[PDB]
Amino acid sequence: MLDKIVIANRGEIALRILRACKELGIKTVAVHSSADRDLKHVLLADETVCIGPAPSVKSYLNIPAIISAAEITGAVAIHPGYGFLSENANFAEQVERSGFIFIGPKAETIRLMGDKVSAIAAMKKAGVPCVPGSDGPLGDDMDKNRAIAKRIGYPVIIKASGGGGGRGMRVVRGDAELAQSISMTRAEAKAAFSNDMVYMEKYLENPRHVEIQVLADGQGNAIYLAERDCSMQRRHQKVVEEAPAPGITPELRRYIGERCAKACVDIGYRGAGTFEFLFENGEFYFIEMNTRIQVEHPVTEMITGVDLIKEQLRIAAGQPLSIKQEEVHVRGHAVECRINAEDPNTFLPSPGKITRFHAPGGFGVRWESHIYAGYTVPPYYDSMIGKLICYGENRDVAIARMKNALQELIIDGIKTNVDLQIRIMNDENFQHGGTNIHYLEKKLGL
Ligand SMILES: Nc1nc(N)nc(OCCOc2ccccc2)n1
Ligand SMILES: [Cl-]
Numbered sequence: 001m002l003d004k005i006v007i008a009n010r011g012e013i014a015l016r017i018l019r020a021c022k023e024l025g026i027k028t029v030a031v032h033s034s035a036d037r038d039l040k041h042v043l044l045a046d047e048t049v050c051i052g053p054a055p056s057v058k059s060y061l062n063i064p065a066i067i068s069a070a071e072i073t074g075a076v077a078i079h080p081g082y083g084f085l086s087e088n089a090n091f092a093e094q095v096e097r098s099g100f101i102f103i104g105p106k107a108e109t110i111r112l113m114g115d116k117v118s119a120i121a122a123m124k125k126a127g128v129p130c131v132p133g134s135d136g137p138l139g140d141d142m143d144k145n146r147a148i149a150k151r152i153g154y155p156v157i158i159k160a161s162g163g164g165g166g167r168g169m170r171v172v173r174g175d176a177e178l179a180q181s182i183s184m185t186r187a188e189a190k191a192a193f194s195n196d197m198v199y200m201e202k203y204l205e206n207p208r209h210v211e212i213q214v215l216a217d218g219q220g221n222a223i224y225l226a227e228r229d230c231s232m233q234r235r236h237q238k239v240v241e242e243a244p245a246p247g248i249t250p251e252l253r254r255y256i257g258e259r260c261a262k263a264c265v266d267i268g269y270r271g272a273g274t275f276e277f278l279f280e281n282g283e284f285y286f287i288e289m290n291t292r293i294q295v296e297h298p299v300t301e302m303i304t305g306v307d308l309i310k311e312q313l314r315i316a317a318g319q320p321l322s323i324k325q326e327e328v329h330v331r332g333h334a335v336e337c338r339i340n341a342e343d344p345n346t347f348l349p350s351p352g353k354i355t356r357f358h359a360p361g362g363f364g365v366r367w368e369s370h371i372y373a374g375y376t377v378p379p380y381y382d383s384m385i386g387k388l389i390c391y392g393e394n395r396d397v398a399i400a401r402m403k404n405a406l407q408e409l410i411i412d413g414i415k416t417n418v419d420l421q422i423r424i425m426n427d428e429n430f431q432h433g434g435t436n437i438h439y440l441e442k443k444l445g446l
Pocket of ligand 1: 131157165166169171201202203204205207236278287437
């Protein structure tokens, strides 16, 4: 087991990781910005290092300062969490070059999955079903580009290869808009990613977001831990996630899951990972892979009993997966509501001092948050301040428990989305299940 690790993150995920470390006897180093001295996990850590001022560029994205902190403390590994540097291949490369363990895949694998064109080619080769598309980058030849779009069939979507998660894309519904659409996506991708490579896919009209959780160790074991539905979104940002995905049969789960595990083996994947699919008319289509642990990992933990952060740590230390595929069983149902410090009308971040705080409790209730009474939410970081996860023997119980837990949650002094979450839980279509990726924005517009 790893003696000591730097937690290269903040907020709820840093606390999530700290608890896993404590359970395993692993010493913790909390690197933090000067605005995050009073973070819960910082106050609980074995050692703390202030790595820079509030702005992320000089703290949580500051590669030299993070690696220096690992060096000075005698840490052996760095857990990147999600966001920040977690999908940064050069960071992972530098960490390993510096002689520390990066809690994640090899830098090569991060790089492969961050290049959406090469990722898709690897998945298609591995037997993972993908979206009909260009199978390659689009060039400047607009006659060729029109031919590709005709072959695929309109509507199509142009996507940046260095992009992802709704960033760097636009829908094309006919020839007339194709040239300008490619040109604009390209320009935006050059500006944002210093990588102007774009590709084409069939635009799916009403899909669900269904993603598969995997774990792969360094002993060659790779398993899938069912799926999550993350269709409830606003501006491509997940709002609600659940596990398992409604309407997914054990046969479908097994079908897609086995293909994801096989793909892990083929590419030499290591650690936690997530295969993102669009699901429509009973079919999966791979869009992208995330190499990090994700925000919504707790719903998977609730229905499988597998602690995914502890698995990440075990994997990094050279231990094999603690469970076999035949030992992984979907039991019950879990829903996660993200709690955001945001204005209800503008949807803009609403930072400030929490004056009164109360967490919900009870059977099946899991509150993932660093917030406490008197804690100030800084303006410099993401608006997500907590995660409410509720588990039940079935979906109706999980949702019932979520409604009750949301009503117990008190966060005064700042504006939050608790009222919105309650509205979603009470939404008749959500209660039926299987709403698509456009539902929430449609509901909010009505
Ligand atoms: N609908 C859809 N089709 C394809 N081929 N790819 C993706 O990627 C996810 C990007 O998300 C959206 C969501 C709504 C509108 C446009 C893109 N979506
Ligand atoms: Cl994430």
